[PDB]
Amino acid sequence: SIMSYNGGAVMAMKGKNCVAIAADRRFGIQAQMVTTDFQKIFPMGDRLYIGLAGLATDVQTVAQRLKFRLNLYELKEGRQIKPYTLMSMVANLLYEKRFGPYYTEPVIAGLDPKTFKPFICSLDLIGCPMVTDDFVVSGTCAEQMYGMCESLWEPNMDPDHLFETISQAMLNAVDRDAVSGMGVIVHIIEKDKITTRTLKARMD
Amino acid sequence: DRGVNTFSPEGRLFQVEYAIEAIKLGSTAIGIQTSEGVCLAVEKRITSPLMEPSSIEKIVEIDAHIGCAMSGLIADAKTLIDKARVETQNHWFTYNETMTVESVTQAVSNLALQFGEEDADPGAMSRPFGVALLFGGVDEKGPQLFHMDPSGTFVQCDARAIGSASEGAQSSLQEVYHKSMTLKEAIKSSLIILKQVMEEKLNATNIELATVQPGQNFHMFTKEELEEVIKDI
Amino acid sequence: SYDRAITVFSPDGHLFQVEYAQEAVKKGSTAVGVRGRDIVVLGVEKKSVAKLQDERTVRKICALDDNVCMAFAGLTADARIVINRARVECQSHRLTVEDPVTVEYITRYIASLKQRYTQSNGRRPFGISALIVGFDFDGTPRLYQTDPSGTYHAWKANAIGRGAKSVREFLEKNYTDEAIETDDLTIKLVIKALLEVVQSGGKNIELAVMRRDQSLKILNPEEIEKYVAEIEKEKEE
Amino acid sequence: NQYDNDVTVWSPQGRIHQIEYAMEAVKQGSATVGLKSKTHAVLVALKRAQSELAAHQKKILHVDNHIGISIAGLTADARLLCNFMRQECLDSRFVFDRPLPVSRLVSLIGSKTQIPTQRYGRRPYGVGLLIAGYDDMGPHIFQTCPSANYFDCRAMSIGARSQSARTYLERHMSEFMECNLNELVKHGLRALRETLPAEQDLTTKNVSIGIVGKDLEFTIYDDDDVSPFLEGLE
Amino acid sequence: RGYSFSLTTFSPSGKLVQIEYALAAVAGGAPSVGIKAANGVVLATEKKQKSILYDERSVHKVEPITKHIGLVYSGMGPDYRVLVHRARKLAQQYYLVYQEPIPTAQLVQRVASVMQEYTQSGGVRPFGVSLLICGWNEGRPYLFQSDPSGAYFAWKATAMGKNYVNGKTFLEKRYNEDLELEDAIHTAILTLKESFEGQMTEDNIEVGICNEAGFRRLTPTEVKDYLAAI
Amino acid sequence: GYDLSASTFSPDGRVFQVEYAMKAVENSSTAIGIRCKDGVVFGVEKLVLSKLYEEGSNKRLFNVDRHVGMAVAGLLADARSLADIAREEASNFRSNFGYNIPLKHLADRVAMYVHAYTLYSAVRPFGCSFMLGSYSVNDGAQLYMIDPSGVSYGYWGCAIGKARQAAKTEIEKLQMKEMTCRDIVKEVAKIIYIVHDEVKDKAFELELSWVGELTNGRHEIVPKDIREEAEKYAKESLK
Amino acid sequence: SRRYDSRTTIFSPEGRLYQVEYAMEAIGHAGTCLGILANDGVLLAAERRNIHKLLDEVFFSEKIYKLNEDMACSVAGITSDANVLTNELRLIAQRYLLQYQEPIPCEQLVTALCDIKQAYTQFGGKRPFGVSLLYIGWDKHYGFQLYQSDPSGNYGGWKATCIGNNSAAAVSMLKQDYKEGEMTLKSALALAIKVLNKTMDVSKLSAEKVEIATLTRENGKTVIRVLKQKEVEQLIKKHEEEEAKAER
Amino acid sequence: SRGSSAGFDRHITIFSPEGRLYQVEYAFKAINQGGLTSVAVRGKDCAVIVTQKKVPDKLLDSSTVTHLFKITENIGCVMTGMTADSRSQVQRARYEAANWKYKYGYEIPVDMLCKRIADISQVYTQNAEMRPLGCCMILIGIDEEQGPQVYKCDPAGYYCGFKATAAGVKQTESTSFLEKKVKKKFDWTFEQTVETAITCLSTVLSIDFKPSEIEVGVVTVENPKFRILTEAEIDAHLVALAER
Ligand SMILES: [K+]
Ligand SMILES: [Mg+2]
Ligand SMILES: [Mg+2]
């Protein structure tokens, strides 16, 4: 399967007045790890991030083409993009390739630039959007991730509890997937600060 | 103000008649056809001692059996020459034989009226070529010289001059030319005539001469070989 | 798209647009070239000075490739287009041939570009002349000139732009085996040629050199005024 | 004036000055004659030489085994039109394995040369043709014009001083249908000779002959090959 | 095949006369008025209603672009219809990508850019109209003008077409920042009365309003009610 | 100057290039068409510009379909091009819809093509007027005339060219509704001989064609012997 | 059609491009616009023409445009033409960033746009764009920079410069007061107000009537700001206080 | 200003210094070159078009001389102006209506068809290379909600709906006649719609028609198909007018 060629996993999670987004760090080609610090989460805003799992080349191309489109939007418009509006922009970019798609399935996590209301979504590879109030997952260990998130996630979590939850969901999920892991990165996004951590994690 | 393909009341295309007037601004060139080969000779028209005379090329090789002398707006000649070269190689590619001088001249002359400004491609010619050409070579019909002008009219000539002093030079050619004449006589004759008509004193750097012969490929004369012929003249 | 013939023949066989492009060239800053023995030099006028100008941004000498550069006189916007097309072509050549361009190859390319824009619908001619210099792979030094018509020639030395006629007359009398025996004198020959037309000497001669293999040196105004005073005190004697 | 530069501008008299001007190109070419009998069609042309040392311009061109042409006007237009004709003849033999009938080829010319007379920035063809051919309907002489109009002829002359030829051809045309080939070419040459200044004669250097008919594919006679035809204008 | 050359060029003095001359068409157009209230916007225009034979309701000058944006003009009506159509199409193109109604300022920019094209592109003349564009987004009202050159401007209030100079000074001496919508409708109609001639009916003026609820035209019976005080 | 382009109205709302093209038709020799009980007959005054031309040459009567004739006046190359358009239109109709194109529809289509050349600086108006004639049991006899503006109307009788008016007045004397094609040929020939100016332009050929019950709805040249008798009738009626 | 074609991209007999020259006249009448380079930054200062009492004040400036994170520009001439060009600038800058994943160097952005302008003078028979632009920016190759381009597609880099109304006069004043290698943003601001004070001779200078934007570096990041009116008034006052000291 | 002109503003559709389009103004004069007038009136129950039918030549097939055209089964039209231009505009209208039906699955409204034709005409007022059509189109049909409709569009690309209108040589005079007749009528509507239309035309020309000198086209709420009256049907209205 094309989506498993590089492996990898991203998820996002909602809390009270905050969101988290997390990703594995492996860049591999089938069985072979090539690197352990590959970037899969990209800022699209001060309080707005997009994580992409899938074919590594397309992760990079989508992030770059999206940033092009976003930078033009912000110059032309007043303003910083709203989370919901970035989702639609991504949907549109992915569906343009309906018949020869990018092999990536994004998650978006952020806070509204004026209201600071938490937002998360994911999209399939042709741009079908999906908003939730709890969590989203994408990657080669989606089943593992769903099991962790459905069992651990609770409503209205403060930034500390959200960090522990998303971290445990990622770690324990990727430890059941051969082609995901070699490290985890977690961003916690609040009104006044971004907190970025790498986790202690298995490297097999 | 009018279009480039407008006829005059006399039935000529204005742009073609005007292009022919530009030939009269060019340097004089002369061609003579003999049974032993053809020669081509051209006034360089050096405008400064700082100019390198060998960087004025007004006789060019088309193929091993065909040379071309030009007069008028020399920059316009480049597409025409390249077309003659490509066409002789195409013919060699396809038929494994040398193209006749007449055929080469024809192919080039079919470009002459291919200009206009609403029929054609996003970039076709907007005006005729301000250039006349003498094609001199040897094929199975023997030695041969043809003249072409911007109208696309071409014709075989036993001897011809083109450019500024062509009336003049053409009269002198009618006086000296005969069908039994040798190539060496025709080379002297054309150096004599360029000498009369040139505004500068003739020497071995401000003219070019080339030949093509039955036995022998296109040959541009060296400074040294020019000096040899210049002695008697 | 615009299919109008812009350059057309007039009665008498003139191409007026081309002649008018040449008038553009004659109002351009003076530019000079000399072909030395083992060096080639280019220099060009002021133009108007201006203390507040960033000098770097308005140079009129330009590398095309490692072994070929040029100067121009005329419309500077037109020049920039011609320059980048020649730069593209040098790399195109190197691609399909793995030798650098000869100086004549790229000169011939530039000139045929310029000729095309005198014979294509919807375009005016380029309002520039260029002096193109460099060395071939066999070490022979080269100076060529092109003008708006697409005509080109090789020169021992030459000027273009305003007051080219008197600078060429100066070079005709002053270019000899003695004036090009060394590099220093070759460089000086270019500066005496400019200082003749250059209104407040000097100051406002940009200058540049190319030695066999060594690639393009431009000179700073500390390295220029050395040569200036080194010639000015000589013409007193 | 404001009406004479564009083929798309009708004058207030219902004329198109550009087309009339293109016709002048053919009036100034050297004369050529076309005539036919029951069995053959013949073309005869005067060739002009720019000087004593130039060849003498070609005036007669092969189109197909059964069709040839004589030209007057801009030679470059003559060649372009000739190449179109040749192509239509090849196409018809490729498709049908039989010669293109001459009247159909002429129609194709009419349709093709009319097109630029009605489009801005285009120009008429500056050439007139005499077309000799032979098909199932026998010999033909057609004439084509810069107007794109064409004519089916018992005989014809075009070019400079061609009125004299036309007058000769009218005088003798009732004899043509029953002539043998030798007689018919002689008639063609006498018509052409009427176009000449009294000083000048027909020679092997200035006469070109084209012949096609029942027994014979289109054949061009130049230089020494015209001598048999010139001997016995007595 | 098309004329590929520009029909608007620079004169010796640096003027683009075809644009000025477009402006002169706009100056001879029927009066139009735009007022930005605190809680909304009003557009109003005169219907040059010759003959009682016209069916007044059959065509409109005040037009919806989206649920939240509306338009009026002064100048040549058929040129206006082109721009109404393009504006609508631009609004939808934006909505398909962003799934959000186009902000008024973004719509105006895109429409003004189209107007600029017709001052430079081959074989065409500029539009002989100025648009007034009203809208509501970010909980706040907007009023814009866009002229034949493609230049646009944001206004608190303005007037265009016949007698606009006077209309503008009338509004200067009458608009304030804290003005309500219902009062703004009144003063908009008064500005039109200042250059009317003929007695106003609900059938020969057209009024559009814009607020939080959206953009709509006023109905004849609503306009009648505002005219009962005038 | 307001008369240089078909894309320019004059200040009185005329399109002078179309009027100038009409003038080319009005300089041409005369063609007529007559509809009768059982078909349509065409005649043309064919001026003889040289005795060197073949008797037949420069036809001004064409078959545009098997059931449709075309008669032209004006600039002949324009007319011939229009006959090819008409042919293509009839051919395409048969391919797409499966039956012989109705005369009225063919006229309307070709007329709209003619009309398209009256709007633009890029092209000029055609310099020709033409008539189209046909007959079938279902549609009866039909005769249409199209001018350089692209206006098309149906006729009982019609004339185009320089003796247009003189021809019309002679045509008005016939009760053509009640007559047959075999009778009308003689009258067409007669009318051509009346309007011919034998002092100004000397010699002419008569060209005749017809389409009717007697040709089973096929457009055909009038046979030689019938033409010659119609000429003889016309000549002796002139007297 | 030949008759109607005004022939915008041909030479005149003296080797001139009339439409280019005429566009330059249009610019000379437009709102004055200056740029000034200092050791710690760059500024644009522009006259506002959108000054009627009833205008609504909706954007953060009138004639100052952000091009990317490290660059901004101002314009003088036909506003609608300037909107086309500034839009295109933004596009070019994003294309370069896409391809190389670093910001476009300032000079390369200017050159790219200038080649578009040049093309309009040589082919296509369209009118040129009636715009001159001042570009300010920072890049890692040459640091703080100021460029000027005009309708010919010609440009140059400047330590200080002016376009629009009373240009010649403003460049005279800059030639005299500008200290090559010794300006600060604080001194260049005072000079800008000094020059705008001279060149708006119709009539007495005000905050509502000018726009200033500064471009500085802070914490490895480029900062671009449009001065609020309070700062502009406070700067005007300091220039008026300084002219009181002008004699004794 | 006042009739001023610069450059080519009388030859192509560019603005004059007053902001006028002379070429459009001349297209309106071209409407009158045809010599005809047409009138159209709407009542609660029907809409009617009447125009002059001028057959000077005895040699015309008068069945083919008409300015009345079916656009769809339910939309009728009268053309005034240059004839071949008019035909072209009729074809385009038929094409637009058929197209509308194919894409949207219901008949084009009369107002929309008129608008579409007006939008097409507008293009010729803004692009230099072609002239406007020297003709005017009046359209009749029944609208499901609004009742009978009369619409007109012109060479400037203006269009409007009407209680009644006119086109051609006597347009202004017809406008005046129709105005004075509607002021009298309570709720500002006509009733005896065919008679009003013919009477308007008869007055402004001063003719008193034969049945073969006019054509009449109708659509009614009860019978919305466009119908052209026969000579006899027309005669009955002419006879009924005479007898009071
Ligand atoms: K137009
Ligand atoms: Mg794992
Ligand atoms: Mg492992």
Side-chain angles (χ1 to χ4, degrees), chain H residues 70-84:
Chain H
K70 189 182 303 185
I71 307 298
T72 71
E73 301 303 337
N74 291 329
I75 292 170
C77 140
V78 63
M79 297 308 280
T80 311
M82 289 165 75
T83 304

Side-chain angles (χ1 to χ4, degrees), chain C residues 43 54 75 145:
Chain C
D54 193 312
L75 295 182
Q145 189 231 308

Side-chain angles (χ1 to χ4, degrees), chain A residues 183-195:
Chain A
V184 176
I185 184 162
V186 184
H187 298 282
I188 306 298
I189 299 155
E190 293 169 72
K191 178 156 184 253
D192 61 336
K193 51 161 171 206
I194 308 301
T195 305

Side-chain angles (χ1 to χ4, degrees), chain G residues 29-52 54-95:
Chain G
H29 296 328
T32 132
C33 195
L34 62 90
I36 302 171
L37 175 64
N39 292 159
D40 60 338
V42 202
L43 72 92
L44 289 163
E47 188 196 350
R48 294 184 81 165
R49 286 289 166 80
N50 301 350
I51 67 158
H52 193 265
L54 295 165
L55 291 168
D56 190 46
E57 188 76 333
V58 141
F59 305 108
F60 276 114
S61 85
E62 175 193 308
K63 313 169 65 146
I64 301 293
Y65 303 74
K66 193 174 176 192
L67 298 184
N68 66 5
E69 230 55 23
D70 298 330
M71 296 188 68
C73 80
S74 199
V75 302
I78 310 297
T79 303
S80 71
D81 292 0
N83 294 338
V84 176
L85 296 180
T86 50
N87 184 61
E88 188 63 30
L89 286 160
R90 286 166 173 172
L91 280 165
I92 293 161
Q94 290 311 298
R95 293 199 279 246

Side-chain angles (χ1 to χ4, degrees), chain B residues 4 14-15 18-19 21-22 25 47-53 55-57 73-79 116-118 120 122-130, chain C residues 1 3-15 35 104 108 112 115 118-121 123 144 149-158 168 171-172 175:
Chain B
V4 303
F14 283 114
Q15 286 292 302
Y18 301 166
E21 292 174 344
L25 307 171
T47 69
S48 169
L50 300 169
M51 193 174 290
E52 292 294 340
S55 82
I56 291 158
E57 61 168 31
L73 304 177
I74 295 319
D76 287 1
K78 296 310 207 296
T79 51
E117 79 166 81
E118 1 250 322
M125 298 312 146
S126 66
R127 59 173 178 75
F129 298 88
Chain C
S1 76
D3 275 319
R4 182 70 58 229
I6 283 180
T7 301
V8 302
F9 285 96
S10 275
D12 248 332
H14 293 138
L15 299 174
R35 196 190 73 196
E104 185 186 358
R108 179 168 86 236
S112 105
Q115 191 282 333
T118 77
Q119 209 177 2
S120 301
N121 290 321
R123 294 148 179 194
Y144 282 87
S149 64
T151 63
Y152 73 97
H153 296 108
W155 291 79
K156 300 178 212 299
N158 197 19
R168 181 188 293 106
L171 294 161
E172 280 168 350
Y175 185 97

Side-chain angles (χ1 to χ4, degrees), chain E residues 163-176 178-192 194-196 198-210:
Chain E
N163 214 322
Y164 79 96
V165 174
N166 283 349
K168 278 155 70 95
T169 74
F170 182 88
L171 291 164
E172 263 156 79
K173 303 162 67 209
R174 209 165 220 102
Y175 174 76
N176 80 104
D178 324 12
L179 204 57
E180 286 277 35
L181 180 63
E182 309 112 31
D183 297 302
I185 293 160
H186 186 67
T187 119
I189 291 168
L190 287 171
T191 311
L192 287 179
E194 285 286 301
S195 67
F196 196 74
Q199 222 278 358
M200 288 202 167
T201 72
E202 69 276 15
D203 294 344
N204 64 211
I205 62 160
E206 220 167 72
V207 193
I209 57 155
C210 196

Side-chain angles (χ1 to χ4, degrees), chain C residues 1-36 38-45 50 52-136 138-164 166-168 170-172 174-187 189-191 193-194 196-197 200-202 204 207-213 215-216 218-221 224-230 232-237:
Chain C
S1 76
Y2 187 57
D3 275 319
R4 182 70 58 229
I6 283 180
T7 301
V8 302
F9 285 96
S10 275
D12 248 332
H14 293 138
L15 299 174
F16 286 150
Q17 282 286 312
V18 177
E19 295 181 15
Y20 299 171
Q22 291 165 350
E23 294 299 313
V25 170
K26 296 194 297 189
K27 294 196 281 133
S29 300
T30 318
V32 182
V34 10
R35 196 190 73 196
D38 45 14
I39 189 174
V40 293
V41 190
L42 289 164
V44 11
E45 161 176 46
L52 302 183
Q53 184 99 286
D54 193 312
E55 318 198 25
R56 186 183 63 69
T57 75
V58 296
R59 290 167 187 178
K60 302 208 205 299
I61 301 167
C62 292
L64 297 185
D65 210 344
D66 295 325
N67 66 310
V68 199
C69 64
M70 68 170 266
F72 68 90
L75 295 182
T76 54
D78 288 20
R80 191 181 57 260
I81 299 309
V82 175
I83 283 155
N84 297 306
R85 294 283 303 274
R87 285 168 173 164
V88 167
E89 186 53 29
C90 288
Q91 302 303 318
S92 247
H93 186 257
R94 269 180 201 282
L95 209 34
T96 70
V97 189
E98 305 192 320
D99 256 341
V101 298
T102 61
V103 181
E104 185 186 358
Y105 177 91
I106 198 70
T107 287
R108 179 168 86 236
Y109 171 87
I110 287 169
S112 105
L113 174 64
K114 286 172 175 185
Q115 191 282 333
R116 249 182 330 280
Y117 276 62
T118 77
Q119 209 177 2
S120 301
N121 290 321
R123 294 148 179 194
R124 67 173 171 72
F126 292 104
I128 67 152
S129 284
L131 299 166
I132 304 152
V133 298
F135 294 75
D136 302 336
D138 66 339
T140 313
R142 300 292 182 187
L143 170 59
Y144 282 87
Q145 189 231 308
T146 61
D147 80 72
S149 64
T151 63
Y152 73 97
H153 296 108
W155 291 79
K156 300 178 212 299
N158 197 19
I160 53 176
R162 70 174 124 125
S166 53
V167 174
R168 181 188 293 106
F170 176 84
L171 294 161
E172 280 168 350
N174 294 50
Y175 185 97
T176 53
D177 289 331
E178 274 92 323
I180 66 158
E181 186 135 46
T182 177
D183 284 7
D184 270 10
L185 293 168
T186 308
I187 292 164
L189 177 62
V190 174
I191 301 158
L194 268 97
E196 256 173 346
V197 69
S200 210
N204 351 315
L207 209 132
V209 150
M210 186 165 295
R211 297 199 166 74
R212 187 173 298 116
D213 319 325
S215 72
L216 187 70
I218 81 162
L219 322 185
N220 52 332
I224 263 290
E225 175 91 44
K226 174 213 162 87
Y227 289 107
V228 173
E230 186 188 9
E232 192 149 55
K233 278 165 286 190
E234 274 186 342
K235 294 181 172 178
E236 296 195 1
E237 308 189 79

